[PDB]
Scaffold this active site. Structure first.
Site, short mmCIF file in Angstrom:
data_model
loop_
_atom_site.label_atom_id
_atom_site.label_comp_id
_atom_site.label_asym_id
_atom_site.label_seq_id
_atom_site.Cartn_x
_atom_site.Cartn_y
_atom_site.Cartn_z
CD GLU A 107 31.81 40.80 37.21
OE1 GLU A 107 31.18 39.77 36.90
OE2 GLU A 107 31.41 41.60 38.08
CB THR B 118 42.73 45.28 37.04
OG1 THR B 118 41.30 45.34 37.07
CG2 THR B 118 43.24 46.13 38.19
NE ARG C 232 31.87 44.50 35.89
CZ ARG C 232 30.65 44.32 35.37
NH1 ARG C 232 29.69 45.20 35.63
NH2 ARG C 232 30.40 43.27 34.59
CG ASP D 93 41.86 43.54 28.30
OD1 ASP D 93 41.52 42.41 28.73
OD2 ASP D 93 41.36 44.59 28.76
CD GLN E 250 29.79 39.39 31.13
OE1 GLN E 250 29.24 40.00 30.21
NE2 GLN E 250 29.30 39.36 32.37
N1 LIG Z 1 40.32 44.12 45.48
C1 LIG Z 1 40.61 43.58 44.31
N2 LIG Z 1 39.86 43.95 43.26
C2 LIG Z 1 40.35 43.50 42.10
C3 LIG Z 1 41.46 42.74 41.91
N3 LIG Z 1 41.64 42.53 40.55
C4 LIG Z 1 40.66 43.14 39.97
N4 LIG Z 1 39.81 43.76 40.85
C5 LIG Z 1 38.50 44.41 40.57
O1 LIG Z 1 37.62 43.48 39.90
C6 LIG Z 1 36.83 44.20 38.92
C7 LIG Z 1 36.97 43.77 37.43
O2 LIG Z 1 38.21 44.21 36.93
P1 LIG Z 1 38.63 43.85 35.46
O3 LIG Z 1 40.10 43.75 35.48
O4 LIG Z 1 37.94 44.82 34.54
O5 LIG Z 1 38.00 42.33 35.00
P2 LIG Z 1 38.12 41.75 33.51
O6 LIG Z 1 38.89 40.50 33.59
O7 LIG Z 1 38.64 42.77 32.58
O8 LIG Z 1 36.65 41.37 33.07
P3 LIG Z 1 36.02 41.35 31.53
O9 LIG Z 1 36.65 42.48 30.77
O10 LIG Z 1 36.38 40.01 31.01
S1 LIG Z 1 34.16 41.47 31.82
C8 LIG Z 1 37.22 45.65 39.08
O11 LIG Z 1 36.40 46.19 40.06
C9 LIG Z 1 38.59 45.53 39.63
O12 LIG Z 1 38.83 46.68 40.39
C10 LIG Z 1 42.25 42.32 43.03
O13 LIG Z 1 43.23 41.56 43.04
N5 LIG Z 1 41.73 42.80 44.21
MG LIG Z 2 38.75 43.77 30.04
#
Ligand SMILES: Nc1nc2c(ncn2[C@@H]2O[C@H](COP(=O)(O)OP(=O)(O)OP(O)(O)=S)[C@@H](O)[C@H]2O)c(=O)[nH]1
Ligand SMILES: [Mg+2]
Ligand SMILES: Nc1nc2c(ncn2[C@@H]2O[C@H](COP(=O)(O)OP(=O)(O)OP(O)(O)=S)[C@@H](O)[C@H]2O)c(=O)[nH]1
Ligand SMILES: [Mg+2]
Lengths: 335, 340
Positions: free
Chosen positions: B16, B21, B150, B172, B176
């Site tokens: 997360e 993103t 998400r 990517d 987790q």
């Molecule tokens: N408001 C806000 N939300 C963000 C920001 N960056 C990401 N998000 C939100 O956080 C959540 C997770 O996004 P994501 O990019 O999928 O995490 P991840 O690193 O891929 O997580 P994983 O795949 O290791 S489980 C989503 O709801 C995304 O919209 C940010 O800078 N600001």
């Molecule tokens: Mg991811």
């Protein structure tokens, strides 16, 4: 109406710091016979200056080859004359002199006198310049030096947003006219010739250049009219600074003692494989300015520094694009 | 031969944190395609359902428990909890209306504000604010909707794009603890690591054990990477993400930083800080402190073989990412030349 909607950027800084070189980089990105005159002129000024200086330094520098003496004699003869014709005999005397180990040794001691920046650059390409069919490149025009007397505005659109940029004269005679530009200014871009820590200003030949910059910056950061205005600070001539640090012949300590106890910051982000010594020297120069910028302002305005090379198109394209956002922010922060 | 010429980038970082993103931003900015459109609408719906269920499920389980502002809203809570574990949820009109009525109940809002005490998704308030938009038959997700959405990442996905005739292969991964095992498959000939940290999570605990602080987990993960043997020469571009959420959280002051990272109480904003125009000094101080926690690790080893390039980011903001990534192109090229 169009007046307030304009991004109005004012370039400031001492003489020969990089101001017009920044404007040129803007025209090449978002916007000839006389120019070849200017290039030929810089070429003539370069050689005259070096040969003229050999017998004036202490100790003086003599020719590596005694037989070159007639060439010195020619250069000095055609010194300050009316519109010089640039005969073929000029280009060869200049070339032959430049190859002399003594003319070069005088070039190495050029911080002891007033030599122009493009000097080596143009002396290395006398054979290209001399040709009839010579056409100046983008880089030649960047290196070319013409002193700025007056206020020059340059308009250019970038991603549909309009910028009006003001270039001023950097030397003291010119600083009076600066106040004519303070109206509705979005951001000041202050330029610094970082490599000039071992040199002196043309005006009086006594005042250290980097020092003159620090004071001029102080005056600017505390100016009655510019309390609200934020400053984008280009620590320019990174290329020359590095070379000088790596040449190790003129030390920063001798000109700026405090450097002796200076240590590289924990958050310094050096270029891949960049010599540690460059890192230190470039972050020192930065921190000399931040001391001033942090002393006052009361959160009404801020200083944002960058390491630059005004003669490098891709460098100026990168740093300028990375500012387009704060400049927008600053403009809305003015409304 | 084509393998060695391309710019290989590896998105590392905890769950997360923001990795996926950043990938969508690269697509929105450098690849072609408006959106499956139908599969995504379902994801955004699932997102909305989760947030509402989670918030209400928590009301009674919080200590002290939170109560409804309007008691008459009880049959609504009863409905939401009764459709907690239905696999094929049809999303009847009734769902959207109960959700919208509870979201406007002051008590439910109160339990939302205490979401750092349980496990709530980032996009909660975003999707709850447009429940009306999301329910229409002709609902098609905007870019922002796709960005806020998400979906858990369970594997390795590669995204290729071009900027100024220059090719980028970006990998990517899953953040987790479960997925970190697969990470070694991408360590080959990598040009640079982009490390994403969710700056705003200073007051939350990870999902895996509901005990470890999310920011401490990120820090530990960064140490592991920075000092990994297969990576001794690979540089790390640090994306300090969720700056918008950090600032909100700090400006509210309802949960203090020092209460999770005690050393903050004696941290002083660096002399070289460059705050945004009109930034709250509190914000500038918090965000640099977090940046530094990471630099203290990067400056403790490496011996000139690799460095750390930190940036403040907001991944859901297209201009922010566009700008930041562009700024990075020249040193990504330099990293590649340095490898040769
Ligand atoms: N408001 C806000 N939300 C963000 C920001 N960056 C990401 N998000 C939100 O956080 C959540 C997770 O996004 P994501 O990019 O999928 O995490 P991840 O690193 O891929 O997580 P994983 O795949 O290791 S489980 C989503 O709801 C995304 O919209 C940010 O800078 N600001
Ligand atoms: Mg991811
Ligand atoms: N090596 C190198 N040369 C540079 C750099 N910036 C400027 N120069 C060279 O330095 C000279 C001075 O810059 P210029 O733009 O002429 O100064 P200025 O500040 O406009 O000068 P003035 O109008 O106040 S007198 C030019 O010859 C230019 O090509 C740089 O980063 N590196
Ligand atoms: Mg000028």
């Amino acid at each position: 109406q169009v007046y307030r909607a304009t991004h109005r950027l004012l370039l400031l800084g001492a003489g020969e710091s990089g101001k017009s070189t920044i404007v040129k980089q803007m025209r090449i990105l978002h916007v000839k016979a006389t120019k070849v005159q200017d290039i030929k002129n810089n070429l003539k000024e370069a050689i005259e200056t070096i040969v003229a200086a050999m017998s004036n330094l202490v100790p003086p520098v003599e020719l590596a080859n005694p037989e070159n003496q007639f060439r010195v004699d020619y250069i000095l003869s055609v010194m300050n004359v009316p519109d010089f014709d640039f005969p073929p005999e000029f280009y060869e005397h200049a070339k032959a002199l430049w190859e002399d180990e003594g003319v070069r040794a005088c070039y190495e001691r050029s911080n002891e006198y007033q030599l122009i920046d493009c000097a080596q650059y143009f002396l290395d390409k006398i054979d290209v310049i001399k040709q009839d069919d010579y056409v100046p490149s983008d880089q030649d025009l960047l290196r070319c030096r013409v002193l700025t007397s007056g206020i020059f505005e340059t308009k250019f659109q970038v991603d549909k947003v309009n910028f009006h940029m003001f270039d001023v004269g950097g030397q003291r005679d010119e600083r009076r006219k600066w106040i004519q530009c303070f109206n509705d200014v979005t951001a000041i871009i202050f330029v610094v010739a970082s490599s000039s820590y071992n040199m002196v200003i043309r005006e009086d030949n006594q005042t250290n250049r980097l020092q003159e910059a620090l004071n001029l910056f102080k005056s600017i950061w505390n100016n009655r009219w510019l309390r609200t205005i934020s400053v984008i600070l280009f620590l320019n001539k990174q290329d020359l600074l590095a070379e000088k640090v790596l040449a190790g012949k003129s030390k920063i300590e001798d000109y700026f003692p405090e450097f002796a106890r200076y240590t590289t910051p924990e958050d310094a982000t050096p270029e891949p494989g960049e010599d540690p010594r460059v890192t230190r020297a470039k972050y020192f120069i930065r921190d000399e300015f931040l001391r001033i910028s942090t002393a006052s302002g009361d959160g009404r305005h801020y200083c944002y520094p960058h390491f630059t090379c005004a003669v490098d198109t891709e460098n100026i394209r990168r740093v300028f694009n990375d500012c387009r956002d704060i400049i927008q922010r600053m403009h809305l922060r003015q409304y």
